[PDB]
């Protein structure tokens, strides 16, 4: 799974009858070293609930499809949990309630 | 899935049979700002009816065949909406009617 | 899929049962400008038969094995389409006659 | 598959119930010489149990979903395995 | 699939149950001149057992799993033949013979 950082939400009307419904965000994908890139992807929400700035794990191809409901839909990246903290050794990469 | 744009049109006629009657067209990745980038597929747009550029939504892989129809067709991109709107921190930074 | 051009054959006497039979292709990746990659797939072409120097739509992943006879094999990228055109906006980029 | 080196924790308390109690490691991956690279995976390790700076195996995609009890879990990276050697023959890559 | 050259034995006591008895080899990528990249990956080999400086195809993904008794292991990679020559329109660019 990849990290990035939860920045808005995308919607759309016209789009295949499967995705009724299916909450849709647009991610700014982080780095190893907890950075922020000028790299961005759309994944489907329906089960986690992120809200805005939210640091947040991707998983992407068939894994994004084993989410209750997902299965017969086509979306090939998911939010599948909210970070609350990344432990580097002892030291923080990062941290929830300061970022 | 990744935001693209409508750049082209492929045609073939010598092709798998399953692709009998599936408009093959060019769709260009773009960045957050719609800036094209490097990046492309040739994706298959039965279901959604996406035009020359507008924004859509691309799935790839084995998602491609979750549409109606692409069950058993060797799809490994397809597209699955059209965009209306995207905000960020509830700003817009895209809207279909401008 | 992506577009490619048929650049040679791969010839294997010993591989797994399931690929005898299965002809193997090199093909040379092209991007969205219709520009030649320094960047070499091999894809198995048991059903489109593809000629040296054609331009081809690829499949990748599970997408390649939807096709006759690939189910139970261990492919991971197939011709799926000999291209005729490419067009851009109005634009050709590529034809197969010219 | 690809090897990587455990580099850290990520604590979720927020997520796909399906996620319950499966353990996410940050693993950076490493050339041929164990020089980190600038990709990653967070990956689930539940089975093998890996530890800090251990070099470790990883198989992405529905591969993850192969570990028993992996099945249905929106996972696409595992850690599979434990690395002890890589012979490159009589020269020697790795040996933990 | 890849073209790669096998550098190594990847080997392994602590691993999951569905990788036991599962021959491990590093391959090193190569592109199309037959150039070594310095870009490495580990895949299984137990259908065909090619040996050192042989150059073979990979695949890659669930294909992988197609090979008999992978079904149900966590293999994403692994070899599917030791590549004869490569043919290119008339010239011929890699030949087991001669290597």
Same mark, same amino acid.
Do not use: C
């Given at each position: ?9 995308? /919607? ?5 009858? %499967? ?5 849709? #965000?647009?991610?700014? #994908? ?17 089960? /986690? ?6 640091? /947040?794990?991707? %998983? ?18 998911? /939010? ?14 990062? %941290?929830?309630?300061?970022?």
């Amino acid at each position: 799974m990849q990290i990035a950082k939860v920045r808005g939400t995308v /919607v759309s009307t016209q789009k295949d009858p %499967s995705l009724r419904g299916v909450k849709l #965000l647009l991610l700014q #994908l982080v780095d190893e070293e907890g950075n922020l890139l000028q790299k961005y992807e759309v994944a489907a929400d329906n089960s /986690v609930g992120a809200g805005f700035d939210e640091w /947040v794990l991707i %998983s992407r191809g068939s894994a994004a499809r084993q989410l209750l409901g997902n299965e017969q839909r086509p979306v090939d990246a998911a /939010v599948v949990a909210i970070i609350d903290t990344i432990h580097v050794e002892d030291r923080l990469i990062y %941290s929830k309630k300061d970022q």
